């Protein structure tokens, strides 16, 4: 509703709850199953859960929570599955912060910085 910045908090517990259907989250510190378990939960289950854990807003309505999770398939915190449903990707679980691997690009979160030397490379410099 003209962008109250409370909505940055509600989709996180939406994201946390849709992650709970994948696996018990105590293993991320790593058991997974075949495609016989139902790791996913359709949007016609969370829309009751968001009314179950109710917020003091005015609508709590469906047919736009299906697009409120579409920013989380744009933020790549969950992927779509079975043409109408959504489930949390593996890479977004890694927000909790061992021989470190040889420069995976996909761990953008844990690569460190450096006090100013001369031999660095920045993206902009070819401007």
């Amino acid at each position: 509703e003209l962008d109250i910045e409370f909505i940055n908090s509600l989709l996180t517990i939406v994201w946390r709850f849709i992650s709970e259907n994948t696996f018990p989250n105590g293993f991320k510190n790593n058991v997974f199953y075949a495609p016989n378990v139902k790791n996913y939960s359709t949007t016609q289950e969370i829309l009751e859960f968001i009314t179950a854990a109710q917020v003091a807003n005015v609508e709590l309505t469906p047919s736009n929570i299906r697009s409120l999770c579409e920013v989380l398939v744009y933020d790549d915190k969950l992927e779509k599955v079975t043409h109408d449903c959504y489930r949390v990707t593996l890479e977004s679980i890694l927000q909790m912060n061992k021989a470190l691997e040889d420069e995976e690009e996909f761990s953008i979160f844990n690569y460190f910085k450096m006090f100013p030397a001369s031999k660095h490379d920045k993206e902009v410099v070819y401007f």
Partner: protein, 551 residues
Amino acid sequence: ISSLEQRTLNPDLFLYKELVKAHLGERAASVIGMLVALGRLSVRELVEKIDGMDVDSVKTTLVSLTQLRCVKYLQETAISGKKTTYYYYNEEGIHILLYSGLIIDEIITQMRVNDEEEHKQLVAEIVQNVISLGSLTVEDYLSSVTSDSMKYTISSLFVQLCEMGYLIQISKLHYTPIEDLWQFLYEKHYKNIPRNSPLSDLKKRSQAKMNAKTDFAKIINKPNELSQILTVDPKTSLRIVKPTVSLTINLDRFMKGRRSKQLINLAKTRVGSVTAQVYKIALRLTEQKSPKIRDPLTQTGLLQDLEEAKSFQDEAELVEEKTPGLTFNAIDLARHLPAELDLRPHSASLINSHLKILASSNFPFLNETKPGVYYVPYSKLMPVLKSSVYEYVIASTLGPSAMRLSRCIRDNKLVSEKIINSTALMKEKDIRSTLASLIRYNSVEIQEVPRTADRSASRAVFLFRCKETHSYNFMRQNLEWNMANLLFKKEKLKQENSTLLKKANRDDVKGRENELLLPSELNQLKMVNERELNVFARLSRLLSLWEVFQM
């Protein structure tokens, strides 16, 4: 203090002049600088462009650049009959100078599955001078060694390594340009016609073409055909190398193994952690028979029409699932699956359990024809491999919010800013800032509407495309410039510390416990060779990002 002269260089001319000025001298860079900057060149043309070396000192370099595969010449003549060699450049002779630390530490890690031995020091030494000399036979390297206990050992691993790839013999096809190798081969199948044949000219064109298409694929696989291995048990050792051939290194098997290194890294962030290891051995088996990272038939022309690109996509999707090496099942993985996997003993049924999960992900890791028979797609995953790593280099650098728009513009594919803040959830000046810091790169274009007659921006709404190739070719060479800038500051640092490094080589050949010097510069030498190794650290880190868009 800010390198602005180098911001205006052609980032492939600025790269290729730096991968030879550091390795070769400053005379090889002057020759190959003109070859990039002027295309095809003779010898009598190079002596008019360089102006500072004569006709024979350039011929000192030309017989040395062709030794290191950095020149892909052609010896052709005109109709008058003068045979004038037009030397060219080639990139894969320069990429072996670029990948040169990765090639050694790839063949080390690939030859730890055959012998638990110090070959990781020993096979690294034999590959160290197949690159530094470019082309060589085996017996001249066998001439330098003396002990037959090791001479038989290195001759055993030569044919063992060449068995599974990584080395083929040299040929003229290695030193002839593919587009000029094609058209001469295209004209073999044009003048072989009967004179005044009644065939129509478009069918006359197609008669020359498809006869040459399988003929062009034949010539490329002639060094890929293992006829060099044919030296079978003259006294013992049922297969050894051929002595009389000049044995070089190929890159198309290295880059293919380098592509497979990228795909396991994509899998570790999407589909489990233990099942990605199963995916690693899966692609490692069906590896040498895989198609190239780039069809050389594409760069022969052949895209003037629309249908030949469709003809290329026929055989591209053909080979990824109709090749007798590239069709595998869950039965065959346990034959090369090592110990200590611990998938809670190993059995092929639980293999097929974690082979099923590599099909249900949104990334096409492993689809299947038959329910046991899995295969990895290449025409379908490689155009979504680069799209995934491009979204996180934007996310790491331009913030995570810039990742959100770059995908929201990607699927909506003609979206406007009234539709952005409906399908995004940020404040509108924050939208109009992070979009503004994203049009500066080619990640999005802007599609204007001319509401009036002229194309005025006063009363007009703008739309936002997301072109693939304009956004990628810019990111391809933003890295390539940064890759070359980084070696420029490497060489400039070694050249200004030359009197240190000359003292570090001469006075203290062995006596480096005291340097025969003062401690006020060995610490200064410590912060030189640290930065001299830290710059190649950032090189290999950058080079993995760069080679994605090469495929």
